[PDB]
Design a protein around this ligand. Structure first.
Ligand code: A1H73
Ligand code: A1H73
Ligand code: MTA
Ligand code: MTA
Lengths: 318, 307, 303, 318
């Protein structure tokens, strides 16, 4: 919706980082002697109402380098915003495209692609799949912003949040469906039992033959207190270019930014954990041609059931 | 006192339009989301690949303005139940597009017309939109008391108006509504915007609309009489109807141009206010009852339970 | 040139007058501002360039339909629900508003000037049809005959009291204001466009939404042909003694037909909806079309 | 499964018609003087365990014409059957392909394509979509077998079947989901209230620009008896080539064939129908990129609710 894009745009720290990220990449790719010879082909993949288009314009001006912008956006309601802006403000430098990036047949290859396809668990908006499908129209020496992102997990004890999830039971579905799906939540009344550890990582452009975005990750969390595990808080980090990063991981959290709340993977049954014991969690990223989903299971100190098998309770639409 | 809005089918500048409407005391504005005449192709080339923006930007108003002050309108050219297959298919795609844009803006309500008997494919498309995503946006079905065919002037030489008392035939606009909402399976998002005509029908035709979800009552400017002072008023027939409608607490919409050119457009609204103040006040019953209108509560069992 | 800086994308109408000055109406049906404008081109081939125009003016709202009122006057069917009259000055550089009466309750979609030239008839999206006097600037009569949006109205060329109308109620009405009941229904698909025959007072043609162009006599038995694949927007006869009919549609094409409704010319020049056509009075073999693609194409019709 | 293919194959009337259909098409496409010059490229699309491959071999032998067979099949379990047959019996004349026909990049264009992708309502197995996607590797003068198929509907009164559907209510879904989905059923204890009428028709190869397989059909059924409508029985006819047809429509039913039982579209609430009244039903064929489904509604003598809106209760997977 419009007001969903509005609240995204009301985060100036994020776009200043995107501005700075592109700014540097322009300087690296284009030398001083080729300032007015080389025009860089930028392609905002998922332009929305065009905060990046703007940021790309600011970045090019502070860098003092020439750019040619595309603005690919599938949402046709947002494309109305883009075209009105483009007519009034931007002009012919920005070419608004109303298409899926996986489908779009590009008339030109890009030097840079810029995207904003990251959720609270990074890859939960299928940034891997979209950017893989948009990879063909990147130059062989082309850059992706972001170039990398990683998801983190940490076990939590919260009798409040457990009881909150419990109360999301709905008619006409599985009685325990609510436990087999992640939630975006400002975690407040909870206890982080162990330090966050990396779960899934993705690099763009992906150069691994037969690119597979399916994953399986085992994590062991050393617990130093007695407690009762109720779920796993999820965070993420992303590298835009080099030393330009965004993060919602508590220890490396970008200061001031408020564009992503943490995500919560619950479990059906609470699990008691003695001091000295290790919480062992297993996380799968699964997919078919239509859907992508996560499954997860606790294996220590006791086994849980595998959550969300075959994405029965939760899928992410391709 | 009374909640009133303004219907327009011409908005050259959205910001300026609201200002005028708001200055006249109206609470909200019914207007198109795409230009009424801007007919769009979705199948045949080359018109389907028409460049440029399809409508106004959402940035022209604040999010809150869209959410509280604007009511969407389906464009008049959209006819989903057309006999021509091309116009049907085009109207389908266009209807979804306009409805989706309405949801994008986060409009509180959206107007769709019931101006004929068969609105099956209209209902099928709307139902699909309702079951796509999640939204609380209401849908006000524009339905007249008296069908346009039945209030036309008897000025066609070889086609005179029906001068016969057809009891069932004069209730046809209710049957239009009934069938539509049945197809849609009594969606709580679908309500009535009852359009009042110049000549009110028989009493039974009006009683038909008792117990129906009337959210709006559209009042044309044409139906207003003029008094000795030279300002808009209504007949004693219409007055009794408005008095009934005030009990239901509907939102009165004004549509059409200013026929009372000498006076302001506020005069129309001021008359509804005049009527609002001039009603029999709520008795002790209705004073206390005000709040529990059609609120379902479980019967008390002071034997089984302790009160 | 003492006119707006830029005209709107969607060209709605185009008419030639006696000498051969091309009148242009245009509406913005997209973007921030949904207004209209009027333009004059003493040089037809200069169109639609705003820097090379004789006259130009910005209206309050969009222009749905217009028509040449003599040589100086321009009659406008506005979206505001108002019929507007503008008049060229003596120099023919400015365009001042003569009148602008908000009588229709909805978009005025069609307008046509009657034989006398002091009267005109309008059709709106509201069901009303209204008869105007251009001198006193008032509505003479108001007729709610149809049961749907009035699509097209067309005045009889040589008869003041007579005019055609058509609407989405699937009624083609022949009028005559002398009768107590003026309207008279002429005996599948909705009628969209009307055109009187120039040489015959009892003959007319109508285009429908399905693309069929039809040939009707007042007496009765009708002829037709499937010209376009989509709705026919307008029908305009040539100034020839033996006239050619130019048909225009939303299928983005133009066709010129003979008396027997047989295809002579074809032109897929436009990329958007073809809105109007106007034969050059100087050169009868020339035909100017305008569309929403913002083209002003000049066709050489083989005659 | 294997035994699902087994029961298909245990219908000799169907394949004899397919054999005869191909037999004639070979004679029409290849004259007598070009008997041993012209080898026709046949392509069985959806070969299964290969009854058509066999039929195509028989058809070519009785016709005495040369053929080159492909056997496209997506089901990899069936492809095991095909390859074992191909190695032992067929040979290099049959080229077994293990792929989707919509995906498969053909190394050669076909003179004939043969398919068996029809269910009880003809297009309920998405034969339109599959053959549309396989259309590109057909010759410009190529033939499809079947070349056409049509679905029929007829209103039925059955208090038995209504009560049967009712009892298909399941936990953890909509209480009335069972009414918004078709069933394959041998209709026995029922009453056909009106004569079947055609619903949806499909022609292959489709030559209509921007091929759309979405449809909307209004049918009016004159009833001559008092009754209570409970649903709509569905049948189908198909034209294999010319005068070679298959049908489960009662009045034109192929004698002996038992490879398709009728289909049943129920309604939530029974509808009383007086003698002289017309039952008016509306049927939509709907689709998106992922799914295809039907919706339906009764509009006379009284209105029903629209059944299966957005395929909530029933979808057919693409
Ligand atoms: N492509 C993008 N995806 C994403 C994904 C996100 C996170 N997200 C949800 O998933 C989500 C789901 C919801 F139901 C509601 C809100 C969210 C958010 C978006 C905003 N917000 C923070 C916030 C909210 C409210 C607040 F008062 C303060 C702060 C979230 O937690 N932000 C993006 C920005 C992009 F550009
Ligand atoms: N592609 C094909 N699709 C189709 C689609 C069909 C029909 N069908 C079902 O949809 C279906 C669904 C079921 F749960 C069970 C059975 C069926 C059948 C297949 C067999 N049968 C008849 C029968 C069954 C049992 C019997 F003792 C006698 C006769 C049906 O009714 N037959 C095809 C053959 C193809 F080659
Ligand atoms: C600014 S939030 C991310 C944006 O990316 C857009 N988007 C997501 N996936 C795609 C895709 N595959 N192709 C184009 N735009 C996309 C979304 O519609 C949203 O506006
Ligand atoms: C003999 S029953 C029909 C056969 O067609 C196969 N089939 C269905 N759709 C496709 C498709 N798109 N590509 C290839 N085979 C298909 C099915 O797996 C089945 O064996």
């Amino acid at each position: 919706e419009s007001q969903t894009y509005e609240v995204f745009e009301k985060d100036p720290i994020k776009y200043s980082q995107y501005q700075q990220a592109i700014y540097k990449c322009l300087l690296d790719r284009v030398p001083e002697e080729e300032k007015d010879t080389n025009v860089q082909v930028l392609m905002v993949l998922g332009a929305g109402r065009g905060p990046l288009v703007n940021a790309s314009l600011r970045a090019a001006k502070q860098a003092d380098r020439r750019i040619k912008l595309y603005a690919v956006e599938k949402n046709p309601n947002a494309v109305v915003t883009l075209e009105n802006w483009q007519f009034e403000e931007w002009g012919s430098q920005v070419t608004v495209v109303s298409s899926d990036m996986r489908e779009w047949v590009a008339p030109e290859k890009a030097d840079i692609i810029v995207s904003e396809l990251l959720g609270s668990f990074a890859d939960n908006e299928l940034s891997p799949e979209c950017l893989d499908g948009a990879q063909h129209f990147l130059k062989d020496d082309g850059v992706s912003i972001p170039g990398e992102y990683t998801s983190f997990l940490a076990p939590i004890s919260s009798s409040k949040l457990y009881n909150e999830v419990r109360a999301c039971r709905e008619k006409d579905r599985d009685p325990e469906a609510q436990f087999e799906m992640p939630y975006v939540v400002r975690l407040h009344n909870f206890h982080q039992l162990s330090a966050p550890q990396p779960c899934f990582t993705f690099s763009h452009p992906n150069r691994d033959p037969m690119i597979d975005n399916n994953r399986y990750c085992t994590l062991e969390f050393p617990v130093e207190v007695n407690t009762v595990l109720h779920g796993f808080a999820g965070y993420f980090e992303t590298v835009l270019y080099q030393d330009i990063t965004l993060s919602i991981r508590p220890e490396t959290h970008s200061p001031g930014m408020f564009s992503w709340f943490p995500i919560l993977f619950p479990i059906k049954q609470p699990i008691t954990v003695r001091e000295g014991q290790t919480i062992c969690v297993r996380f799968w990223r699964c997919s078919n041609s239509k859907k992508v989903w996560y499954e997860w299971a606790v294996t220590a100190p006791v086994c849980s059931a595998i959550h969300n098998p075959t994405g029965r309770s939760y899928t992410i639409g391709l | 006192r009374v909640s009133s809005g303004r219907d327009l089918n011409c908005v050259p500048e959205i910001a300026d339009t609201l200002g005028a409407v708001a200055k006249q005391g109206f609470d909200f504005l019914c207007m198109p989301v795409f230009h009424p005449r801007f007919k769009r192709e979705f199948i045949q080339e080359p018109a389907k690949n028409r460049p440029g923006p399809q409508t106004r930007s959402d940035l022209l108003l604040s999010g809150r303005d869209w959410n509280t002050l604007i009511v969407g309108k389906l464009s008049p050219w959209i006819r989903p139940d057309s006999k021509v297959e091309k116009i049907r298919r085009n109207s389908e795609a266009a209807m979804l597009q306009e409805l989706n844009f309405g949801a994008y803006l986060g409009l509180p309500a959206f107007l769709l017309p019931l101006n004929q008997e068969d609105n099956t494919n209209l209902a099928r498309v709307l139902t699909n939109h309702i079951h796509t995503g999640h939204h609380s946006s209401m849908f006000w079905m524009r339905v007249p008391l008296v069908a346009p065919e039945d209030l036309r002037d008897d000025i066609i030489e070889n086609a005179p108006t029906t001068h016969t008392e057809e009891y069932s035939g004069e209730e046809k606009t209710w049957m239009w509504w009934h069938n539509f909402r049945t197809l849609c399976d009594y969606s709580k998002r679908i309500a009535v915007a009852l359009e009042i005509g110049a000549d009110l029908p028989s009493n039974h035709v009006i009683d038909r609309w008792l117990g129906e979800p009337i959210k709006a009552a559209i009042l044309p400017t044409s139906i207003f009489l003029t008094n000795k002072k030279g300002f808009p008023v209504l007949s004693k027939m219409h007055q009794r109807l408005i008095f009934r409608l005030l009990k239901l607490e509907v939102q009165f919409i004004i549509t059409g141009t200013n026929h009372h050119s000498e006076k302001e457009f506020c005069s129309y609204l001021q008359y509804l206010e005049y009527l609002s103040q001039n009603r029999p006040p709520p008795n002790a019953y209705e004073l206390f009852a005000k709040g529990y209108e059609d609120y379902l509560q479980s019967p008390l069992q002071p034997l089984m339970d302790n009160l | 040139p003492n006119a707006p800086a830029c005209m709107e994308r969607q060209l709605e109408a185009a008419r030639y007058r006696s000498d051969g000055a091309l009148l242009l109406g245009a509406s913005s049906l997209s973007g921030r501002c949904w207004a209209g404008s009027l333009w004059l081109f003493k040089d037809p081939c200069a169109a639609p360039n705003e820097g090379f125009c004789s006259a130009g003016v910005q209206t309050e709202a969009g222009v749905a339909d217009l028509t040449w009122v003599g040589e100086r006057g321009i009659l406008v069917a506005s979206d505001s629900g108002a019929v507007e009259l503008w008049e060229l000055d003596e120099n023919e550089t400015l365009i001042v508003s003569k009148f602008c009466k908000y009588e229709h309750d909805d978009i005025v979609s069609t307008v046509s000037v009657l034989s006398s030239g002091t009267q005109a008839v309008s059709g709106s999206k509201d069901i009303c049809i209204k008869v105007w006097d251009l001198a006193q600037q008032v509505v003479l009569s108001s007729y709610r005959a149809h049961a749907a949006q009035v699509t097209c109205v067309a005045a009889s060329p040589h008869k003041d009291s007579v005019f055609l109308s058509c609407s989405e109620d699937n009624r083609i009405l022949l009028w005559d204001t002398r009768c107590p009941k003026p309207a008279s229904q002429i005996g599948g698909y909705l009628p969209t466009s009307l055109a009187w025959h120039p040489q015959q007072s009892e003959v007319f043609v109508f285009g429908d939404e399905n693309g069929t162009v039809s040939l009707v006599d007042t007496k009765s038995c009708v002829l037709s042909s499937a010209v376009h694949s989509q709705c026919v927007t307008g029908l305009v006869f040539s100034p020839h003694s033996v006239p050619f009919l130019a048909s225009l549609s939303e299928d983005c094409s133009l066709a010129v037909l003979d008396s027997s409704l047989s295809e002579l010319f074809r032109s897929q020049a436009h990329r958007d909806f073809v809105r109007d056509a106007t034969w050059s009075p100087l050169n009868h073999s020339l035909l100017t079309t305008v569309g929403w693609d913002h083209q002003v194409v000049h066709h050489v019709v083989p005659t």
